[PDB]
Design a protein around this ligand. Structure first.
Ligand SMILES: Nc1ncnc2c1ncn2[C@@H]1O[C@H](COP(=O)(O)O)[C@@H](O)[C@H]1O
Ligand SMILES: Nc1ncnc2c1ncn2[C@@H]1O[C@H](COP(=O)(O)O)[C@@H](O)[C@H]1O
Ligand SMILES: [Mg+2]
Lengths: 140, 135
């Protein structure tokens, strides 16, 4: 079907370095999870493991419908390009003011672009690197 | 070249600049190595010690007093490049605390194997932070 029936779920875009770590934790926490991936290999792996996964690009409206964006509680973007992410965020937000949207970025101008398009939270890798390094340096 | 027991920070871009500003605010003695002439000039204009060159170059490390530094902090994105720098530094300064940036699991393992005390992988920290926002 390439389709899901579930609602009130975390809709996770990407299952690479970032998404796989979120996925594994979300699954442990019994938060209903649907993953969208462009990678056939990753979708096949996820399905083999009993995780709901929709194959396709999250920028495609039919793919979002297949993944039940309309009734998801969270939209979590873990793709690396912040402009691409911003476009997805814009489209999701237009259709639902309430959905919690979290996205990845790597540059300040991406953060701004994504935030302007309605994300609740943007997580910038390089800021988290600096913050975590400072935490290590400040530890006795 | 007048300084010891300092933080020796390699890179002053998105990561290094955020870290360096906090270190300066905390009165931690600091030396920055950068390949960017522009970044070196900006730092020196503010009275921050900075050495222009590649951190893999021995003479450059020497100008930055690696041999008597307290921490070596690598904030460059290329993990395998960082691992070689880590190895060279660890040979020259057996006691130095070494922290480095990485973006892939192969780099984390490698940089550790080459002698780093700590590795921070950006993509891992993105996932950690998102989970905190979630759970
Ligand atoms: N527009 C998109 N729709 C669905 N998956 C994507 C899209 N863009 C990137 N990805 C996936 O996101 C993951 C990002 O991996 P990483 O950078 O390792 O966290 C990769 O596995 C890509 O296949
Ligand atoms: N081998 C190196 N030695 C000194 N500086 C470096 C080296 N490799 C990269 N850089 C600098 O590290 C910074 C990385 O920037 P960012 O990825 O924005 O944190 C840049 O400003 C580069 O000029
Ligand atoms: Mg690589």
């Amino acid at each position: 079907s390439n389709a899901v029936d579930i609602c009130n779920h975390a809709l996770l875009v990407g299952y690479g370095r970032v998404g796989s770590l979120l996925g594994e934790k979300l699954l442990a926490s019994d938060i209903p999870l649907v993953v969208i991936e462009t990678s056939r290999t990753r979708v096949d792996e996820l399905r083999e493991r009993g995780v709901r996964a929709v194959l396709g690009n999250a920028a495609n409206e039919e793919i979002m419908q297949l993944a039940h964006l309309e009734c998801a509680k969270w939209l979590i973007l873990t793709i690396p390009n912040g402009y691409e992410a911003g476009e997805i965020v814009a489209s999701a937000r237009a259709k639902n003011p309430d959905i919690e949207i979290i996205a990845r970025a790597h540059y300040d101008d991406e953060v701004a672009y994504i935030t302007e398009r309605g994300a609740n939270q943007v997580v910038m890798g390089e800021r988290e690197i600096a913050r975590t390094m400072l935490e290590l340096l400040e530890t006795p």
